[PDB]
Write an enzyme that holds these catalytic residues in place. Structure first.
Site, PDB file in Angstrom:
ATOM      1  N   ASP A  90      24.954  40.216 -13.622  1.00  0.00           N
ATOM      2  CA  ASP A  90      25.065  41.435 -14.430  1.00  0.00           C
ATOM      3  C   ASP A  90      23.809  42.282 -14.319  1.00  0.00           C
ATOM      4  O   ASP A  90      23.195  42.277 -13.206  1.00  0.00           O
ATOM      5  CB  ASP A  90      25.339  40.893 -15.873  1.00  0.00           C
ATOM      6  CG  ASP A  90      26.180  41.855 -16.690  1.00  0.00           C
ATOM      7  OD1 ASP A  90      27.225  41.378 -17.245  1.00  0.00           O
ATOM      8  OD2 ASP A  90      25.755  43.012 -16.895  1.00  0.00           O
ATOM      9  N   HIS A 118      23.681  45.638 -20.999  1.00  0.00           N
ATOM     10  CA  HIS A 118      24.965  44.937 -20.738  1.00  0.00           C
ATOM     11  C   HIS A 118      24.792  43.446 -20.523  1.00  0.00           C
ATOM     12  O   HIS A 118      25.449  42.636 -21.190  1.00  0.00           O
ATOM     13  CB  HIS A 118      25.694  45.631 -19.585  1.00  0.00           C
ATOM     14  CG  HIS A 118      27.101  45.234 -19.345  1.00  0.00           C
ATOM     15  ND1 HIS A 118      27.463  44.238 -18.452  1.00  0.00           N
ATOM     16  CD2 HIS A 118      28.251  45.727 -19.840  1.00  0.00           C
ATOM     17  CE1 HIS A 118      28.776  44.117 -18.442  1.00  0.00           C
ATOM     18  NE2 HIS A 118      29.291  45.038 -19.268  1.00  0.00           N
ATOM     19  N   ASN A 133      38.924  47.459 -17.590  1.00  0.00           N
ATOM     20  CA  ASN A 133      39.233  48.255 -18.789  1.00  0.00           C
ATOM     21  C   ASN A 133      40.123  49.482 -18.440  1.00  0.00           C
ATOM     22  O   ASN A 133      39.981  50.518 -19.064  1.00  0.00           O
ATOM     23  CB  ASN A 133      37.931  48.702 -19.480  1.00  0.00           C
ATOM     24  CG  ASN A 133      37.020  47.548 -19.847  1.00  0.00           C
ATOM     25  OD1 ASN A 133      37.498  46.523 -20.291  1.00  0.00           O
ATOM     26  ND2 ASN A 133      35.710  47.798 -19.741  1.00  0.00           N
ATOM     27  N   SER A 188      34.415  42.998 -20.478  1.00  0.00           N
ATOM     28  CA  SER A 188      33.103  42.409 -20.170  1.00  0.00           C
ATOM     29  C   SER A 188      32.650  41.490 -21.316  1.00  0.00           C
ATOM     30  O   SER A 188      31.876  40.604 -20.972  1.00  0.00           O
ATOM     31  CB  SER A 188      32.023  43.520 -20.066  1.00  0.00           C
ATOM     32  OG  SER A 188      32.192  44.198 -18.857  1.00  0.00           O
TER      33      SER A 188
END
Ligand SMILES: [Ca+2]
Length: 275
Positions: free
Chosen positions: A32, A64, A155, A221
């Protein structure tokens, strides 16, 4: 005081924690935007950066990666939140920049690093609309090497009758994770398709943020690390289980929700999965 995010409870992690199963000695790579290793509620064991302009994997300029990592493994103490597998050995594999984007080459380099470094579980809370032979090869190799590979489904919501699951989640070797809220309802944004495997909490998830902070985020996520964390708990109880066994167990003991195109096999239950 410490707070237990709804999602952790929802997947039944605390039952395992009470038994003394907390993911000790299981290596989980968060691929990430990096992890803030300075966060008092996290313990980063190692990692590597594949972002050419951001060489320290332990600085998260996005937020994130830190948030995803907290879901997997925020420490069990008297502060902040609690992760799914609070004793997991957490690795920051930085493949995304400050802006939350990254090149496929960077991502793949991170996967290759995780295989070579003997990660037990890979979490990829990322995705793109298109795949590559190199991306497939890397995930396939990880699975063949015995790594459990988990990814956010995407998403993109619904689009007629087509799959909106992104890559690498779309590949059969990867566990694709969709999002539900606290009432078990699919989140409107959650990607759909025959490649969806399981669901996990992904709406208003409270976790760790850089600079000794905490906040909520929504997305697939956020769902994926609940599953990565779950795999870590299973492995702590059954160290000799192969990645195949871990996967089958998670898929086979879900709480069935609606149709598989929208919910896959349903909501994971780590308690049931861990036998
Ligand atoms: Ca804590």
């Amino acid at each position: 005081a410490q707070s237990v995010p709804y999602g952790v409870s929802q997947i039944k992690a605390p039952a395992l924690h009470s038994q003394g199963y907390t993911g000790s000695n299981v290596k989980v790579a968060v691929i990430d935007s990096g992890i803030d290793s300075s966060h008092p509620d996290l313990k980063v064991a190692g990692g590597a950066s594949f972002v050419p302009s951001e060489t320290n994997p332990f600085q998260d300029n996005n937020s994130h990666g830190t948030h995803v990592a907290g879901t997997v493994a925020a420490l069990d103490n008297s502060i902040g939140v609690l992760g799914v597998a609070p004793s997991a050995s957490l690795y920051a594999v930085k493949v995304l920049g400050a802006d939350g984007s990254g090149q496929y080459s960077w991502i793949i380099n991170g996967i290759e690093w995780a295989i070579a470094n003997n990660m037990d579980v890979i979490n990829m809370s990322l995705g793109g609309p298109s795949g590559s032979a190199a991306l497939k090869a890397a995930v396939d190799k990880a699975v063949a090497s015995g790594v459990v590979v988990v990814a956010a489904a995407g998403n993109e919501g619904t689009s007629g009758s087509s799959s909106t699951v992104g890559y690498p989640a779309k590949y059969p070797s990867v566990i694709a994770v969709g999002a539900v809220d606290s009432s078990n309802q699919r989140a409107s944004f959650s990607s759909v398709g025959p490649e969806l495997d399981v669901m996990a909490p992904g709406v208003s998830i409270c976790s760790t943020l850089p600079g000794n902070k905490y906040g909520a985020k929504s997305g697939t996520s956020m769902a994926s690390p609940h599953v990565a964390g779950a795999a870590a708990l299973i492995l702590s109880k059954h160290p000799n289980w192969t990645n195949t066994q871990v996967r089958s167990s998670l898929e086979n003991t879900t709480t069935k929700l609606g149709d598989s195109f929208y919910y896959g096999k349903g909501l994971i239950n780590v308690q049931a999965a861990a036998q």
